[PDB]
Amino acid sequence: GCVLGLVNSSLFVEDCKLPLGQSLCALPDTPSTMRLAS
Amino acid sequence: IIPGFGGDFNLTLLEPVARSAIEDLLFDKVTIADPGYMQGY
Numbered sequence: 001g002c003v004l005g006l007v008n009s010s011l012f013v014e015d016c017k018l019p020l021g022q023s024l025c026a027l028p029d030t031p032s033t034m035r036l037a038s
Numbered sequence: 039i040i041p042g043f044g045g046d047f048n049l050t051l052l053e054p055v056a057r058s059a060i061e062d063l064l065f066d067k068v069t070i071a072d073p074g075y076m077q078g079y
C-alpha cells in the first residue's frame with residue numbers, strides 16, 4: 001500500500017501501468033496473472 | 039524547456055526540478071484545508 005493507505009494485494013512495485021478501467025490514484029496492474037504497481 | 043529558455047524573458051514558469059515556480063506561488067497563496075492523503079487516520 002502507501003499510495004492511498006493499506007491494500008490486500010500481494011504483488012507490488014510493478015515497473016509501470018497503462019491507463020486502465022476501475023483503478024486508484026495510482027492505477028494498479030491488471031490482476032489477471034493483484035499487483036498494486038504505479 | 040530549460041531555465042535559460044527565456045534567455046531575455048524572465049518567464050518564471052521554468053520547471054524548478056515539475057510544479058513550476060508560478061504553480062508553486064499561486065497554489066501557495068491560496069488556502070486549502072484538505073487533510074494530507076495516507077495520513078488522515
